[PDB]
UniProtKB/Swiss-Prot annotation:
Gene: treT
Gene Ontology MF terms: trehalose synthase activity
Organism encoding this protein: Pyrococcus horikoshii (strain ATCC 700860 / DSM 12428 / JCM 9974 / NBRC 100139 / OT-3)
SUPFAM superfamilies: UDP-Glycosyltransferase/glycogen phosphorylase
Name this protein carries in UniProt: Trehalose synthase
GO biological process: glucose metabolic process
Biophysicochemical property: temperature dependence: Not thermostable. Approximately 25% of maximum activity remains after 1 hour incubation at 55 degrees Celsius.
Cofactor: Mg(2+)
C-alpha cells in the first residue's frame, strides 16, 4: 500500500475554480469544510495512473486539502495475478454470469488485502473511503473506530451472483455505500445507508479545459477534419451497444439534406481489449471508404487533449447508447456548451433535460430530426448549449462533487 503525496493536477485548490463557480459557492463550500477542519479523510484504490477514478483523486485530494481537511491517498500493490482476478471480479459484478469465482481466487484477493493492510493503520483516520472492489476486503483487517465508506464505480443491479455474495461480506460492513446512479444499489444492502453520488468532470483537466482556437485547429487539420463544414460527433468506447452503427445511419440520412456534414467517431480504448478492437474493425468496414467519417482513436494518437478539441469543434453531439453507465462523455459535451442528442439510458436520462439542454430520442429517425433541427437553428442550439453548461456547473463539477462528500461527513 503506497501513497500519493504528490499529484498531477498540481496544487489544485478551491481558489483555482473561483471564476467558474462564483464566490458565493466557494464560500458555501469553505463553510461546510470548517465543521470538518483538521480531520482525516483517506482514500484507497487500485492505481493512481490508469483510470478516471485516479484522474478524479489527483484533483480531488489536493482540493480537499486546500479546504481544511487532511485528505490523503493510499494505493494498493499487487502481482498481475491479483489484477487479472480483479479484472474478472469487475466484469463478474457487471453481469457476465459466466465467470466462476474459486477459492484460489478468494484466497489471493483476501491475502493481498491482508498484506497491504499492514503498511498503514487505516482505522486511525477520522474517515475512510475505499474505491471499487479490489480493496473492499480491507475493512476487516482493522478494528473500526471511525466511519468507513465504500465507493462503487460500476453497475450492481445485475451482478454475477457467485461474486456478489462474496464481496458483500465486506461491503455490508461500511457505514455508507456510494453509487453513481439509483440502479446500481443492490437490494442485499440497506437503502437507508446508501448514497447516490453521480461522478463529475474536472473543468481544469486535459479533457475539459478550454483550449486556444489555434490548438483546436491544429488538432483538426491533423486528423483531416474541416472546421468549415458541419460536424456531428459521438465519443465513446467501441462496443456493440453504444449505438455506433445507428449514428452511422443518422449521419447518412442527415447527409442527404446536408451533403457537407462530417461524422466524428471518437474513442480511446486499451490495447488489451480485443472485444473493443473487433467492434472497431467492424465499424471501419461498415463505414467503407466514406472519408467524411473520421474514426479517431488512441491507436492513431488521439488522447484527452485531442478529444477535447473534437468535442469543442462539434456542432451537435450524439450518445445513442443502448445500455449505459453514467455517461461522463455526455457531461463533458454539456460543459463545452454543446446540445446532446441521446437515448434515455443510465446516466444519460439524468443529465439531459429533454427540450432544454438537448434531446432524448427513442430511435435513429427521431435522432435525425433533431440533428437537422439544431443544425438548421443554430441560435436554438446555442441556447440549449448554454443551459447545458449551467446544468453541469451547478451539478456535475468536481467542486459540487466534493461539497457532496462534505455533506456526507457532516451527516455521520
Ligand atoms: O472512448 C472513450 C471512452 C471514454 N472516455 C472517457 O471516459 C468518460 C466517459 O465514460 P462513459 O464513456 O461515461 O463511461 P461508462 O461507459 O459509463 O463506464 C461504464 O463501464 C465501466 C467499466 O468499463 C464502469 O466502471 C462504469 O461504472 C460504467 O458506467 C469521459 O469523461 C471520457 O473522458 C474517452 O475519453 N474516450
Amino acid at each position: 500500500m503506497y501513497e500519493v503525496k504528490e499529484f498531477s493536477s498540481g496544487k489544485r485548490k478551491l481558489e483555482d475554480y473561483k471564476s467558474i463557480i462564483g464566490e458565493e459557492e466557494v464560500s458555501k463550500i469553505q463553510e461546510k469544510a470548517e465543521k470538518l477542519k483538521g480531520r482525516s479523510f483517506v482514500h484507497v484504490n487500485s492505481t493512481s495512473f490508469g483510470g478516471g477514478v485516479a484522474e478524479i483523486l489527483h484533483s480531488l485530494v489536493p482540493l480537499l486539502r486546500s479546504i481544511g481537511i487532511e485528505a490523503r491517498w493510499f494505493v494498493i500493490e499487487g502481482p498481475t495475478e491479483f489484477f487479472n482476478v480483479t479484472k474478472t471480479f469487475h466484469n463478474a459484478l457487471q453481469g457476465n454470469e459466466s465467470l466462476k469465482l474459486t477459492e484460489e481466487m478468494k484466497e489471493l484477493y483476501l491475502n493481498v488485502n491482508r498484506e497491504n493492510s499492514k503498511f498503514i493503520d487505516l482505522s486511525s483516520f477520522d474517515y475512510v473511503l475505499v474505491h471499487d472492489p479490489q480493496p473492499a476486503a480491507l475493512i476487516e483487517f482493522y478494528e473500526k473506530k471511525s466511519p468507513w465508506l465504500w465507493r462503487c464505480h460500476i453497475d450492481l443491479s445485475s451482478p454475477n451472483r457467485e461474486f456478489w455474495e462474496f464481496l458483500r461480506r465486506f461491503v455490508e460492513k461500511y457505514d455508507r455505500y456510494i453509487f453513481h446512479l439509483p440502479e446500481y444499489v443492490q437490494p442485499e444492502l440497506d437503502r437507508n445507508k446508501a448514497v447516490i453520488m453521480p461522478p463529475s468532470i474536472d473543468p481544469l483537466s486535459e479533457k475539459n479545459v478550454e483550449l486556444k482556437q489555434t490548438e483546436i485547429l491544429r488538432i483538426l487539420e491533423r486528423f483531416d477534419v474541416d472546421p468549415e463544414k458541419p460536424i456531428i460527433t459521438q465519443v465513446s468506447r467501441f462496443d456493440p451497444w453504444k449505438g455506433i452503427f445507428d449514428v452511422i445511419e443518422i449521419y447518412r440520412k442527415v447527409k442527404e439534406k446536408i451533403p457537407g456534414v462530417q461524422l466524428l467517431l471518437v474513442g480511446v480504448m486499451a490495447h488489451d481489449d480485443p472485444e473493443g478492437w473487433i467492434y472497431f474493425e467492424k465499424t471501419l468496414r461498415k463505414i467503407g471508404e466514406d472519408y467524411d467519417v473520421k474514426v479517431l482513436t488512441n491507436l492513431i494518437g488521439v488522447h484527452a487533449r485531442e478529444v477535447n478539441a473534437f468535442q469543442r469543434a462539434s456542432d451537435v453531439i450524439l450518445q445513442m447508447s443502448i445500455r449505459a453507465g453514467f455517461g461522463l462523455t455526455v457531461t463533458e459535451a454539456m460543459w463545452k456548451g454543446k446540445p446532446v442528442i441521446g437515448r434515455a439510458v443510465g446516466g444519460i436520462k439524468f443529465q439531459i433535460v429533454d427540450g432544454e439542454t438537448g434531446f432524448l430520442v427513442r430511435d435513429a429517425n427521431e435522432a435525425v430530426e433533431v440533428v437537422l433541427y439544431l443544425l438548421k437553428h443554430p441560435e436554438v442550439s446555442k441556447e440549449m448549449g448554454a443551459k447545458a453548461k449551467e446544468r453541469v456547473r451547478k451539478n456535475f463539477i468536481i467542486t459540487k462533487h466534493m461539497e457532496r462528500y462534505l455533506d456526507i461527513l457532516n451527516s455521520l
